RNA sequence: CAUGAGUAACUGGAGGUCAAGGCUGGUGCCAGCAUCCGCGGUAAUACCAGCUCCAGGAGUGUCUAUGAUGAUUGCUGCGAUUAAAAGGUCCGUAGUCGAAGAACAGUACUUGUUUGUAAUGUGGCUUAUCGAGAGCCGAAUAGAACGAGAAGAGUUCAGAGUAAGGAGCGAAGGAGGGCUAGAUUAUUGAGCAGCGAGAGGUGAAAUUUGAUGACCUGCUUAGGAGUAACAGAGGCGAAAGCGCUAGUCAAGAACGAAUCCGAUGAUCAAGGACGUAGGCUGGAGGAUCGAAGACGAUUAGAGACCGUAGUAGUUCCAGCAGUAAACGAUGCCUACGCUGUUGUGGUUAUGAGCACGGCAGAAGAGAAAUCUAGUAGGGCUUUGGGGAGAGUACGCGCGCAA
RNA sequence: UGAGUGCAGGGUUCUAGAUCUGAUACAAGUCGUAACAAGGCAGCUGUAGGAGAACCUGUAGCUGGAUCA
């Protein structure tokens, strides 16, 4: 065998389609987002199919789109899973 | 035997196209096959511009142009000598022609 | 049709294909018993009714000597060719002749003779080759 | 869908012609494993790894310089021990070398082992 | 390829390698099981149950916590529908096309779409009435 | 065993295939020969004879069926871009063909033992001078009885979830389709006003129209078609096909992603639905163009090509019909496969991908031209077998007819 | 149980027939010249009229075209 064929470089991994690999890769992940102002934390999915509003203050925190969802201008997040 | 790879026309990924009429003989020809010619002609001939300079009332004048797109069927284009017969290797060369006046 | 349990489909298809062969078709679906010499018999007896001549096909230039024969076994009348150099002189009207095939796959014309399909073999019970070359004489 | 044992053969035949030394084969079944394991016993292929991807399966293999050709037969004809030499003479290039593989109640075996064990079976494929 | 047309699309979503337990989440097992059965009684399809659980409550693929599948849980709770939800969505689209054609009779393209749709219904029916999921003499609403 | 003796070859051929003569005399496209190709018109190695050679030989020529020749019937093993040959497009029953993982069972499958073949045939040995011949031996096909093995095939399961299918979610794209309400010009026709002699048409002209005012320029109106330029080796649709602007009504394709169900699938006789144009049955309408018909020219003649004019049709609604060079002359699923460049729509670690394309080489392939044609016992349907007669006759099914 | 034979019909295969209409071969007859060169109006496929005869004319299509522009 060839090392190149049995163990691809991480560069090669990132260029391929998610299915066309030796082992298929998950692209979606979960995150904790915190609201500007009220500083409450909400669990969200990347690639969300639904618009989401902050607990309590009801500010729209996350907007659904054709691809990866859009966090509102002031808010911030961390990957949890 | 098959003479041209594109069957002599520009249709691909379509069933059917609009027809147009030949300028010289009014024959119907498909739009994607017709020979096309562009013209931009001054309303006034070059041999008169030196008289125009003394005839006009205005301080300066720009002559109006006239614009045309003409269409020809194969027989007319060959006969009027817009196109000519070419050798088996020349047939493949594609280049844009000049706009006429 | 190439599956392991496909034998029935395969057999019925391949049988139907064979009718495209002219040979198999004629044996199956044509009139193979219409002829004086053929599937039916190797030789045929008949009586001479008229003497006849025919032009050769182009580019040759000749008159070929032929005979009108009434065939005993079918009651058809047919044209036959008389092979040898002076052969026509060995035959009288109302003689009996035996007649033979020209040797093609179907009954077909041979050489330059248009539309004639048999040839004479014996006259009055004796070989025409012997008659012409004067090796034997007419029964009289 | 294509037959998995046919797919295996075309994948290695083309790669061999293109002078590659290794390939990945994308859909694998139980008899495909046993076929590859046969080619390893006779030294036609060198190294085998199997990937357990939960999506069918896939294999990575190293080719030797000794492999000229392989192929599957479809359908898988039943043969008596009397019949196998007919197929041997049809498929293989020489009486001296190469293998015709047959499935039997004793696993995959070659046309010589058929004589030793005294058994026919079903015809599967060949390599030389 | 596609069944009624010349399509060869490839858009799907990847199933994980292992499933674990979603420890990052903010509810118990029993709460998640309560959320499902509520959404069910309100009349939502089980594919929508899955979407909500992922989007709002933060659970992927809705099985890592429960060790049981959504439709099986609904049968355990007794909330099973009269017709499988796939066959049900095919009858709806047929009705819609017939209601359009009823007022716009001239539409040859809609006529074309109806005969395709109707074929798909009976192909699905014959599956279910073999697995004993429908009565043998069931017929479309038409 | 013993007596006499000295007898005993023909059939087909000799230009090529195909072994063996440009030998001598007759005949001059005659008479004849020749399976096929071909010989002969006065210098015939091919006819008719003489003489020498060749081949097989107690035998050799001919006719007729058949097996082989022949991969020109194709299971092994042919073809379908242009030589003969992929159904105009879909749906669909019978039929043929159908994941991974973990297990289970023995009727096919393969094999043992035992039955099942006189003659013929097969492997042998022994005796008629020899050789066929005769006599004796051994094993045997298909078919059946009882055991055995479990890879492939088959049946089941769910702490399993296809670059298999169907249902559903999110943001977006397109001359895809039906309906409602509007639009800028243009071509004809009428009304009225101005002007006062030609307009039209062609390679060149005549029919023809104009003082009842043409032509051209104004203002008014009435209709019925159409959507120029932008506009492309651009887009959409199952194909046929689809190009002005708004509003409205259903369904579909593709893309993103940790949604749901679980074999629901491929291809398809019979049966069913769509199908440019021209045509037919009934209604509406009728601007432009124009089969038929009628003239003017040109020609030996033009019935045609050109010009004047003119009807059915050309448009719409409700139906019938079922053909096209319905063509990329290349069936549908599913694979394995080199590089560079340019598009269209989404998505993006901004490195790239996925679907649908164009172009230019390479390597292989092929009779070449060229490449939807490379590699290959993957599955299923259609289809060809030297020219003609013939896609014709008779019968049958659909259609108002064609 | 039934041979034979009446009388109507059918199913098969052959054969007669005034007259009409195909095809094939016609050494070389009569009238034109439709195709193959831009063959003297570029050719061909479907459909509909017309015509001594090849064929001509309208409508949609194709290049196997005289143009890969
Ligand atoms: Zn907040
Ligand atoms: Zn023209």
TrEMBL record, chain B:
Which InterPro entries does the record associate with it?
A: Ribosomal_eS26, Ribosomal_eS26_sf
Gene3D superfamilies from the UniProt entry = Ribosomal protein S26e
Provide a GO biological process annotation: translation
Sorted alphabetically, the keyword list is:
Metal-binding, Ribonucleoprotein, Ribosomal protein, Zinc
Entry similarity comment: Belongs to the eukaryotic ribosomal protein eS26 family.
Q: Which GO terms describe its cellular component?
A: cytosolic small ribosomal subunit
Q: What does the entry list as the binding residues for Zn(2+)? A: 22, 25, 73, 76
GO MF term (any one): mRNA binding
Q: Kindly name one Pfam family recorded for this protein.
A: Ribosomal_S26e
Q: What is this protein called?
A: 40S ribosomal protein S26
Q: What PANTHER family does the entry give?
A: 40S RIBOSOMAL PROTEIN S26 (PTHR12538:SF0)
UniProtKB/TrEMBL annotation, chain D:
Task: Cite the entry's keywords alphabetically.
Answer: Ribonucleoprotein, Ribosomal protein
Answer whether the UniProt record assigns the keyword Transferase to this protein.
Answer: no
Family of this protein = Belongs to the universal ribosomal protein uS8 family.
Organism in which the protein naturally occurs: Spraguea lophii (strain 42_110) (Microsporidian parasite)
What GO terms describe the biological role, i.e. biological process, of this protein? translation
The record's Gene Ontology cellular component field reads:
ribonucleoprotein complex; ribosome
Q: Which domain of life is it from?
A: Eukaryota
Short name of one Pfam family for this protein? Ribosomal_S8
User: What GO terms are given for molecular function?
Assistant: structural constituent of ribosome
Any idea what this protein is called? Answer: 40S ribosomal protein S15A
Automatic annotation (TrEMBL), chain E:
Q: Which UniProt keywords apply?
A: Ribonucleoprotein, Ribosomal protein
**One CC-aspect GO term:** nucleolus
CDD domains to which the protein is assigned, alphabetical: S15_NS1_EPRS_RNA-bind
Q: Does Thylakoid count among this protein's keywords?
A: no
Q: Which domain of life is it from?
A: Eukaryota
Q: Which residues form the Small ribosomal subunit protein uS15 N-terminal domain?
A: 1-59
Task: Recall the GO molecular function terms of this protein's record.
Answer: small ribosomal subunit rRNA binding; structural constituent of ribosome
InterPro entries, alphabetically? Answer: Ribosomal_uS15 (IPR000589), Ribosomal_uS15_arc_euk (IPR023029), Ribosomal_uS15_N (IPR012606), uS15_NS1_RNA-bd_sf (IPR009068)
What SMART domains would the database entry show?
A: Ribosomal_S13_N
Q: Which Pfam families match?
A: Ribosomal_S13_N
What GO biological process terms does the UniProt entry carry, in alphabetical order?
Answer: maturation of SSU-rRNA from tricistronic rRNA transcript (SSU-rRNA, 5.8S rRNA, LSU-rRNA); translation
PANTHER family per the UniProt record, alphabetical: RIBOSOMAL PROTEIN S15P/S13E, SMALL RIBOSOMAL SUBUNIT PROTEIN US15
Q: Family, per the entry?
A: Belongs to the universal ribosomal protein uS15 family.
Question: What is the official name of this protein in its record?
Answer: 40S ribosomal protein S13
């Amino acid at each position: 065998i060839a090392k190149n064929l049995l163990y691809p470089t991480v560069e090669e991994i990132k260029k391929n389609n998610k299915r066309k690999q030796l082992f298929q890769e998950v692209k979606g992940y979960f995150m904790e987002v915190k609201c500007a102002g009220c500083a409450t934390l909400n669990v969200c999915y990347s690639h969300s199919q639904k618009t989401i509003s902050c607990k309590g203050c009801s500010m729209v925190i996350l907007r659904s789109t054709g691809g990866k969802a859009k966090i509102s201008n002031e808010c911030s997040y961390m990957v949890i899973s | 035997t098959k003479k041209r790879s594109n069957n002599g026309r520009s249709k691909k990924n379509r069933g059917h196209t609009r027809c147009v009429r030949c300028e010289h003989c009014s024959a119907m020809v498909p739009n994607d096959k017709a020979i096309k010619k562009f013209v931009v002609r001054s309303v006034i001939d070059a041999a008169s511009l030196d008289d125009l300079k003394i005839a006009t009332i205005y301080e300066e004048y720009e002559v109006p142009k006239s614009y045309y797109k003409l269409n020809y069927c194969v027989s007319c284009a060959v006969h009027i000598k817009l196109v000519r017969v070419r050798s088996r290797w020349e047939r493949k060369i594609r280049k844009e022609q000049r706009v006429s006046a | 049709m190439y599956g392991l349990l496909a034998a029935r489909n395969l057999k019925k298809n391949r049988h139907k294909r064979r009718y495209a062969d002219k040979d198999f078709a004629k044996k199956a679906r044509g009139d193979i018993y219409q002829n004086a010499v053929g599937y039916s018999a190797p030789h045929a007896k008949g009586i001479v009714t008229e003497k006849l001549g025919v032009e050769a096909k182009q580019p040759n230039s000749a008159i070929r000597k032929c005979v009108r024969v009434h065939i005993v076994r079918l009651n058809k009348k047919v044209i036959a060719y008389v092979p040898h150099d002076g052969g026509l002189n060995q035959i009288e009207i109302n003689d009996e002749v035996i007649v033979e095939g020209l040797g093609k796959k179907g009954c077909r014309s041979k050489g330059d003779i248009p539309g004639v399909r048999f040839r004479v073999c014996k006259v009055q019970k004796v070989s025409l080759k012997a008659l012409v070359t004067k090796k034997k004489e007419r029964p009289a | 869908m294509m037959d998995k044992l046919a797919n295996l053969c075309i994948t290695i035949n083309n790669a061999n012609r293109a002078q590659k030394r290794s390939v990945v084969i994308r859909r694998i079944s139980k008899v495909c494993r046993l076929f590859l394991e046969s080619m390893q016993k006779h030294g036609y292929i060198t190294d085998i790894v199997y990937i357990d991807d939960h999506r069918e399966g896939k294999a990575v293999v190293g080719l030797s310089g000794r492999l000229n050709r392989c192929g599957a037969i479809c359908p898988r004809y039943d043969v008596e021990l009397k019949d196998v030499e007919r197929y041997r003479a049809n498929l293989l290039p020489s009486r001296g070398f190469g293998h015709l593989i047959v499935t039997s109640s004793k696993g995959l075996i070659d046309h010589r082992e058929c004589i030793q064990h005294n058994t026919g079976g079903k015809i599967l494929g060949y390599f030389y | 390829a596609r069944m009624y047309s010349n399509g060869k699309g490839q858009s799907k979503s990847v199933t994980p390698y292992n499933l674990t337990y979603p420890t990052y989440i903010k509810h118990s097992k029993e709460e998640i099981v309560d959320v499902i059965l509520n959404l069910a009684r309100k009349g939502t399809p089980p594919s929508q149950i899955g979407n909500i659980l992922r989007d709002n409550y933060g659970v992927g693929k809705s099985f890592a916590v429960t060790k049981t599948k959504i439709l099986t849980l609904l049968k355990i709770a007794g909330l099973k529908p009269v017709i499988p939800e796939d066959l049900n969505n095919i009858v709806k689209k047929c009705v819609n096309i017939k209601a359009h054609l009823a007022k716009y009779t001239n539409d040859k393209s809609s006529k074309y779409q109806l005969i395709q749709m109707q074929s798909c219904l009976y192909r699905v029916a014959r599956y279910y009435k073999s697995k004993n999921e429908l009565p043998a003499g069931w017929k479309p609403p038409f």
